[PDB]
């Protein structure tokens, strides 16, 4: 799924993925869209720093908690501090090392110093046509799924 994002073997990775869905449905993913016009996953650009922090009882919690609502509360409404952080997480014309350093500076000030970093990861966007084809192709071959939350 990562190589399907782009690079020397993107075509092979994409071929493997569309074959995998066709194996699920008995063929026909191709009746919904062209995978060579619509690559399966696009890059999100800003990559992911993973890690965890300890809470007040010493439990491990995901560092991703300082998300947009998280960061706004962490700065207690200081929008300028928020926007500096937010730009760090969005402007990807900025070399990732510079962004990583500022992201770590922000965790020490807002999350705390009890922060451990773990293996990093990529993020990408699933092509809306891949999604249409996967969901409809399964439903279209009769593998009906009921919603348990029938109304809210």
């Amino acid at each position: 799924f990562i190589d399907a994002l782009g690079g020397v073997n993107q075509q092979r990775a994409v071929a493997a993925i569309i074959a995998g869905v066709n194996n699920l449905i008995g063929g026909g993913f191709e009746k919904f869209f062209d995978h060579n016009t619509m690559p399966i996953i696009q890059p999100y650009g800003t990559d992911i720093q993973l890690g965890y922090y300890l809470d007040g009882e010493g439990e491990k919690q995901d560092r991703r908690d300082l998300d947009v609502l998280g960061a706004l509360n962490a700065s207690d409404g200081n929008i300028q501090e928020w926007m500096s952080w937010y730009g760090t997480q969005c402007n990807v014309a900025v070399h990732p090392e510079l962004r990583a350093r500022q992201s770590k500076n922000f965790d020490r000030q807002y999350l705390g110093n009890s922060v451990t970093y773990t293996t990093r990861a990529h993020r990408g966007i699933w092509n809306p046509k891949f999604i249409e084809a996967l969901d409809k192709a399964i439903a279209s071959v009769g593998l009906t799924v009921a919603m348990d939350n029938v109304a809210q």
Binding site: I2, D3, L5, G6, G7, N9, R12, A13, A16, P43
Partner: peptide, 12 residues
């Protein structure tokens, strides 16, 4: 901006 590729296998 670019995608590096490591030595994946089985699917290619």
């Amino acid at each position: 901006p670019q995608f590096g590729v490591g030595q994946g296998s089985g699917f290619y």
